[PDB]
Design a protein around this ligand. Sequence first.
Ligand SMILES: Nc1ncnc2c1ncn2[C@@H]1O[C@H](COP(=O)(O)OP(=O)(O)OP(=O)(O)O)[C@@H](O)[C@H]1O
Length: 286
Amino acid sequence: PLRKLAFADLLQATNGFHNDSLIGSGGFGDVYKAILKDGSAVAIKKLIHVSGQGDREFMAEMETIGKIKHRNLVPLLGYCKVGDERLLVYEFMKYGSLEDVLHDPKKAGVKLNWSTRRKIAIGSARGLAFLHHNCSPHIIHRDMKSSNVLLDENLEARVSDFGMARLMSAMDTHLSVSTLAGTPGYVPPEYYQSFRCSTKGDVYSYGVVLLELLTGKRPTNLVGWVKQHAKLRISDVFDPELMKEDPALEIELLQHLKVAVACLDDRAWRRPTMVQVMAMFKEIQA
Ligand SMILES: Nc1ncnc2c1ncn2[C@@H]1O[C@H](COP(=O)(O)OP(=O)(O)OP(=O)(O)O)[C@@H](O)[C@H]1O
């Protein structure tokens, strides 16, 4: 069960929030790696801007990822809400974010061959499909991107960062919101025109991620550049390290590219659902 963690425990597990335990900061707050007094390896997120943008994000995760468990979603282990302080505690994912691995620090890190990236794309997709289909009310993530796909010890994908997620009734096609949420290079185009979000928006953003697995490049655009070279020579867009592995899987890559293109359609009604995406990934291996 989700644990209510005392603020002092988190203070001491991070050595008084010392810089040496900091592994990320900006916008939302801070993220620290720590070992809890019971031995648990965890990531502890310290939210800033409480009683406003910070407290809304806190409740967003509590009402979504804090209420569900799934093999392809980051497990939220605990929380701490003491006055002005807002903290959330997650199981520590060994290999960090997909963005860090994909754009390796000093060109060094874990090498991801196609078999592993394909596993990452299927796991990521199953995570979102659970949010869109199996959860009632459905969950719209609203900020899917490669920094929000974490990789555990087995290089399995686990979707993270529900600070902007929202609940939508199953008897609704969209959710009208107050603000525009998302990251440059991942926003669905219809989010710029309407204060509305949907599972088809998550599908768009998932498409960008699958493109990062296929091309190896950052979204900042990348979506349009692939769409332009898709009508020319689609052999000049995939990650060069994937073609070194085997040029015989270029046919398999193109089929995954078609899945990505369908997710990235400017029309939300034409995008697949994540359940269709999963089924499509399965037909490629059959
Ligand atoms: N459970 C976890 N296990 C291991 N590392 C984590 C975990 N959660 C977060 N991190 C690391 O902390 C950093 C911040 O994570 P978070 O998702 O809160 O930032 P973000 O909003 O995605 O940042 P940005 O999108 O600006 O890169 C990430 O780079 C990630 O690698």
